[model samples]
Target: GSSGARCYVDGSEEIGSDFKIKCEPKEGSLPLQYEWQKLSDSQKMPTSWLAEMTSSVISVKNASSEYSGTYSCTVRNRVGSDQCLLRLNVVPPSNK
Candidate 1:
């Protein structure tokens, strides 16, 4: 069974920096699987910079403006599945 599925995401990143996010359910059975979705595109595709998806953690390298948008994750086990969303923004590097 599943309950309280959620996503962990770094809210922002630089235009050319790398970023990562994670997903997990508050309550779910063992052997759970993860699925990622890019909500910005109708095709539900992972962006070109996406380094990984099948893992519970999403790794996006060299992020660009196009990567700044809504994304989602789902957790599924034998009994059920649940999904959650995340919002990401890419900003131009400022004085650091």
Candidate 2:
């Protein structure tokens, strides 16, 4: 049997900070396909300081307000397809 995609975290983040959103299916067939999406924003693939957007990891570089929102990734294969979400809360950077 195939299980849906499982995300590591659904947490928030701060502006100017770098982070990675990871997701994977608990149980699924091999050769999983990955697709990234922004839930709150456009259906189009928005650009950012993305280090990598793969089947298992979505890395963000120097996160900013422009990057703040609900993000999701869908993973699929011949067996089945699943999706997970991650909310990015970017705030103003402190001048410390």
Candidate 3:
């Protein structure tokens, strides 16, 4: 009984090594629930490697430096909720 939904996501400025990081939300309203948070600060994103990826997708199984961070994609439905932030630059897989 409402038509003012809001919530969007889809931004990845950078990501490297064994790439596979996705968390969608180009619009919201109705059964949209996804939570992911690990706002960097050196390195902190290891909940069993995001529980082996599923909540949208986050499978970067390589690239050291503890897999650089700053990730968050909180989304909710029922007509009000939003979140978006992504920045992963773990480039170190080049050896000649």
Clashes per candidate (backbone, < 3 Å): 0, 0, 0
Q: RMSD for each model, in Å, please?
A: 4.6, 4.6, 10.3
- Candidate with more favorable, higher lDDT: 1 or 2: 1
Alpha-carbon runs more than 4 Å astray in model 3: 1-16, 24-29, 32-67, 79-89, 93-96
Q: What's the residue-level lDDT of 16 in candidate 2?
A: 65
Cα shift from native, residue 46, model 3 (Å): 28
Can you tell me which runs of candidate 1 are displaced by over 4 Å?
1-6, 26-28, 31-34, 41-53, 78-80, 94-96
Better of 2 and 3 by TM-score: 2
- Using lDDT, rank the candidates from best to worst: 1, 2, 3
What value does the lDDT take at residue 6 in candidate 3?
23
lDDT of 2 at 18: 67
lDDT of 1 by residue, 33-65 (tens): 666666553334445324325555565543564
Strongest candidate by TM-score: 1
- Whole-model Cα lDDT of every candidate shown, in order: 0.60, 0.56, 0.50
Residue 53 Cα positional deviation in candidate 1, in Å, after optimal superposition: 5.2
Which residue pairs in model 2 clash with each other?
none
For residue 65, give model 2's deviation from the true position in Å: 3.7
lDDT digits (tens) for residues 1-96 of candidate 2: 336566664334566666566766655355466666666442344454232255465665435555556776666666666666666655566678
> Which residue pairs collide in model 1, if any?
none
